[PDB]
Amino acid sequence: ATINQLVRKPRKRMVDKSDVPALQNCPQRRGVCTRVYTTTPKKPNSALRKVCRVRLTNGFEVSSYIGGEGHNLQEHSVVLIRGGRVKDLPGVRYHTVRGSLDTSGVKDRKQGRSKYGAKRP
Amino acid sequence: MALSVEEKAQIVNEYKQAEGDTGSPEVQVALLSANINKLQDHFKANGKDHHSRRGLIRMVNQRRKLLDYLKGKDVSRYTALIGRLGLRR
Amino acid sequence: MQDPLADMLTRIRNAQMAEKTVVSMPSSKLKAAVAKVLKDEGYIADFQISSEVKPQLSIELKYFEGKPVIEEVKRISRPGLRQYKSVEQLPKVRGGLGVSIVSTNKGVMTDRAARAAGVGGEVLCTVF
RNA sequence: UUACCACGGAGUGAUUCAUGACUGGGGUGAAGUCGUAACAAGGUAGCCGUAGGGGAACCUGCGGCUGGAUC
RNA sequence: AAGCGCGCGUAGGUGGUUCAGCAAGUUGGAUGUGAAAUCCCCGGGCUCAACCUGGGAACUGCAUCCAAAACUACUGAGCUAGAGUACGGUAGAGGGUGGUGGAAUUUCCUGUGUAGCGGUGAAAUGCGUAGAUAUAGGAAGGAACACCAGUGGCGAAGGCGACCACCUGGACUGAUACUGACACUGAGGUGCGAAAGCGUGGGGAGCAAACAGGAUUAGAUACCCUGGUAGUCCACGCCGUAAACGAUGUCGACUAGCCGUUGGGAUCCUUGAGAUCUUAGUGGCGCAGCUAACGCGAUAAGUCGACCGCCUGGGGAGUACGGC
RNA sequence: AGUUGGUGGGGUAAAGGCCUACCAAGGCGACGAUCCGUAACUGGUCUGAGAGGAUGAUCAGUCACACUGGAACUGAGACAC
RNA sequence: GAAGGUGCGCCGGCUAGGGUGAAGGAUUUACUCCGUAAGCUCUGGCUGGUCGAAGAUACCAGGCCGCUGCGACUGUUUAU
Ligand SMILES: [Mg+2]
Ligand SMILES: [Mg+2]
Ligand SMILES: [Mg+2]
Numbered sequence: 003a004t005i006n007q008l009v010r011k012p013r014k015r016m017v018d019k020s021d022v023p024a025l026q027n028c029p030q031r032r033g034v035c036t037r038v039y040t041t042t043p044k045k046p047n048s049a050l051r052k053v054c055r056v057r058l059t060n061g062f063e064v065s066s067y068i069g070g071e072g073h074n075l076q077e078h079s080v081v082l083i084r085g086g087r088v089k090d091l092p093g094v095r096y097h098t099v100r101g102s103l104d105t106s107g108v109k110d111r112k113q114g115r116s117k118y119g120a121k122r123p
Numbered sequence: 124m125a126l127s128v129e130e131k132a133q134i135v136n137e138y139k140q141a142e143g144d145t146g147s148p149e150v151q152v153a154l155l156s157a158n159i160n161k162l163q164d165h166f167k168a169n170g171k172d173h174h175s176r177r178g179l180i181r182m183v184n185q186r187r188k189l190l191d192y193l194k195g196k197d198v199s200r201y202t203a204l205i206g207r208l209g210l211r212r
Numbered sequence: 213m214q215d216p217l218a219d220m221l222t223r224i225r226n227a228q229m230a231e232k233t234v235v236s237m238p239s240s241k242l243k244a245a246v247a248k249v250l251k252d253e254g255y256i257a258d259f260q261i262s263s264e265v266k267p268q269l270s271i272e273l274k275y276f277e278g279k280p281v282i283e284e285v286k287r288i289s290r291p292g293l294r295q296y297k298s299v300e301q302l303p304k305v306r307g308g309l310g311v312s313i314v315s316t317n318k319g320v321m322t323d324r325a326a327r328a329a330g331v332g333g334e335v336l337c338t339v340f
Numbered sequence: 341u342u343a344c345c346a347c348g349g350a351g352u353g354a355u356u357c358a359u360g361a362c363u364g365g366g367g368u369g370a371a372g373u374c375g376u377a378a379c380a381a382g383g384u385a386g387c388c389g390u391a392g393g394g395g396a397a398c399c400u401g402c403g404g405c406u407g408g409a410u411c
Numbered sequence: 412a413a414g415c416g417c418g419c420g421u422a423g424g425u426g427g428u429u430c431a432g433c434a435a436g437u438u439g440g441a442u443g444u445g446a447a448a449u450c451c452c453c454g455g456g457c458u459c460a461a462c463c464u465g466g467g468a469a470c471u472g473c474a475u476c477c478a479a480a481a482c483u484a485c486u487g488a489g490c491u492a493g494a495g496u497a498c499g500g501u502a503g504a505g506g507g508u509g510g511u512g513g514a515a516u517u518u519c520c521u522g523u524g525u526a527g528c529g530g531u532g533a534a535a536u537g538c539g540u541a542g543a544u545a546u547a548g549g550a551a552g553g554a555a556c557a558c559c560a561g562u563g564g565c566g567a568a569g570g571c572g573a574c575c576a577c578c579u580g581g582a583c584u585g586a587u588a589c590u591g592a593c594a595c596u597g598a599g600g601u602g603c604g605a606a607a608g609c610g611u612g613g614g615g616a617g618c619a620a621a622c623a624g625g626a627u628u629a630g631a632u633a634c635c636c637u638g639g640u641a642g643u644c645c646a647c648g649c650c651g652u653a654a655a656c657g658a659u660g661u662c663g664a665c666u667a668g669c670c671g672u673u674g675g676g677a678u679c680c681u682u683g684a685g686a687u688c689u690u691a692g693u694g695g696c697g698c699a700g701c702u703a704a705c706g707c708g709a710u711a712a713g714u715c716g717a718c719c720g721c722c723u724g725g726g727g728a729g730u731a732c733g734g735c
Numbered sequence: 736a737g738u739u740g741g742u743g744g745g746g747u748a749a750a751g752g753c754c755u756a757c758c759a760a761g762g763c764g765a766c767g768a769u770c771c772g773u774a775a776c777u778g779g780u781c782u783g784a785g786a787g788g789a790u791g792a793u794c795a796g797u798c799a800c801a802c803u804g805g806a807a808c809u810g811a812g813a814c815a816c
Numbered sequence: 817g818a819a820g821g822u823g824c825g826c827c828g829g830c831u832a833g834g835g836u837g838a839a840g841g842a843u844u845u846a847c848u849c850c851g852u853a854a855g856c857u858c859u860g861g862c863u864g865g866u867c868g869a870a871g872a873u874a875c876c877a878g879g880c881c882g883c884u885g886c887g888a889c890u891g892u893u894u895a896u
Contacts, residue, residue, distance in 0.1 A: 004717095006718075128498080131497075131498095145498095146495070146591080168507090169507045169508065170507085172506055173506075174579090174603095175581090176580085176602090177506095177567075177602090177603085178579085184419065184420075185495085187420095188495095188593070189495085213662075214425055214716060217482095223714095224665095225666095225714060225715080226713090226714055229666065229700070230666050230667070231667095237664090237665090240428065241428095241481085266490095287715075289483095291425055292424080294436095294482080294483065296438085298439090314481095316438070317479050318438095320482090330438095331439065333481070334482050336481095
């Protein structure tokens, strides 16, 4: 606090590490699905969320949430992954963009179509 | 205070700058030096007297501080003091 | 010890918390001169220097409605961080109601006069 | 022809990255086994340093503290 | 979440008061430069806007020069308020080195004397008819010093309790005398640092980690009991940690009071024997003030100033790795 | 250890360990030398009340590079997309 | 001697010092001290040239490194 103590050692600012290290300062990355599975949420929640392990183009292996109702993804499927974690899913820190490359948009969606890659009918 | 009043009265007049002078640095440094050298005999026989050694270290630091002040004031007076006392080892 | 000036303000400030009438303390050029600005500004009633080999500085204090006139007095140019300002950069205490004593080269004198005189200096303390 | 010097070569180190049978702790778990160590004087007051011991929380000794109940 | 366990001290940071000088800091001005574009202000042209553009402002900077001397820095000369020295005295478990004493425990020897002693909630292990415990006399040995004893004292802190002798540090106290800012703090560094622990050598009464047995318990690697080794003790080395705490860094100044206590001093009381001031400590309330509250409150966690150390959510973790 | 100075000489358009011969043991560094990782720099840009924080696209100034390493030639000017 | 590497012959040019040492001087006291040109002798430094396939040219004269068991180590022992 002393102005002399500050002169020798200036105040230091911490730099928080990104919560999406596998994305590497890019808005989205392309990867392929190595394993499609369902997992169980934490204490409060109880469901079967669809998550897939993705091998990204920079070599990172991550698991990203598959949003929406129903998906057509299996092994060896090219997907685009976006940031944003899932709070009730441990270890999931990315989202799979529906409507790009192989992952088709959710069928029969009417509200919030752009967020889930849904065509206008 | 290991120096007797006779020893203190002995060394004050040999290092006084004028009559009645007991506060001049020459008297102080000479007073500390005689006490520092006298205590060396005690600490030889009593090597576990850590509490009395704290006082001896203070007398050593006090003498150093006085000599540094005498350095700034009059370097010639400083030079004669250590030569007469045999300091700056 | 290492800031006789800030001892002056804190001696004044402590007394006004205790509703004392006069204070005493060793004097100096800065202490007497700052008392000059305070008296001519009306924050202190009067100050005297007891001219002896060890001079004191005595301030009698002002209260308007029981509350002390000096609501707050704060040192600025402490010895650890001496503060120097230009004429344009001089502080305005409480939007001009207060006074920020500034030791310019035309003697110790207020911030209002310093702007008029067009000279800066060391911002010693702020009063209100 | 000599001097300088790039490529290339030899030896020996340093550092960094990735892997490695096996091994150690850590975290999270939908809850299983063994106890019940702390929270009330938690049923031997607790905790700190240290040493020894024990399936485990822990126990014991030595010093210290109150961030201990009754009085 | 955060005051290093505590001193000393290097670099550094900051430094009582008076006079004079200087002008690096400081202040004002001038000059050169600080490219253009952009930011900003006032206008102009695209039907407006985006956009373009005119001029100005700014570029908080640097360099030089000129003025000023309140403060800082420097220089010179002083002063005593800080700091220190000289003298008398006071109190103290302050430290070190050697002796000495009493109470008690244990062990051993001897006498008396006979069925228990010891232990626990109760028991049992244990001791005892080979004569225990108890009691009396003697001897050896080690450790700690009952009463005094007191929010008492001393010490930088850790700590220090029998008495005496020797060596030795500091504090408090009174006046006079002397130096004259010689000061404060302090990264590194260095020194001391409970207990446990480690090494070498001694010593070993009591206590007692480990260990063994007896109980309790569903179990009891414990609590309880019976023993008992290291250790606790001494010398010389090492360690370097504690809830090393007032969980409150050091130094200086100021801010109502009241009630105790330790070592002094001064005046009334010269009292025989109390009272009033003052100082260095040590406690309890308490105005103001502060605090999230609890509470602190002249021994501040209030109002300030100098310096230093430290904190940036919990766990992972004061852990891994490397260095010493 | 040309390391840091000095002296003589050479060399450059020009001073200089730029090079060399000899002499001395110097030079930098907790005011962070050396080493490791990253990185073109600035005017500027974004954000912010400001102080600050982040950043160095377009445009402008400087720098470095031209498949990798090195070297000179010509030329006023290069060690030359 | 970890490992590993460079130089090394001969002939010139320049150059730095040991030792010894008539002189001379001193103590011109004496088996005295200082010192000494040349001459002998020893150790270097910096350069140039030159021959051969090869210069520590013969004889002479360590091979070295990594992991691991055992014994700490030098030593002693079954003369055969
Ligand atoms: Mg084998
Ligand atoms: Mg052998
Ligand atoms: Mg044989």
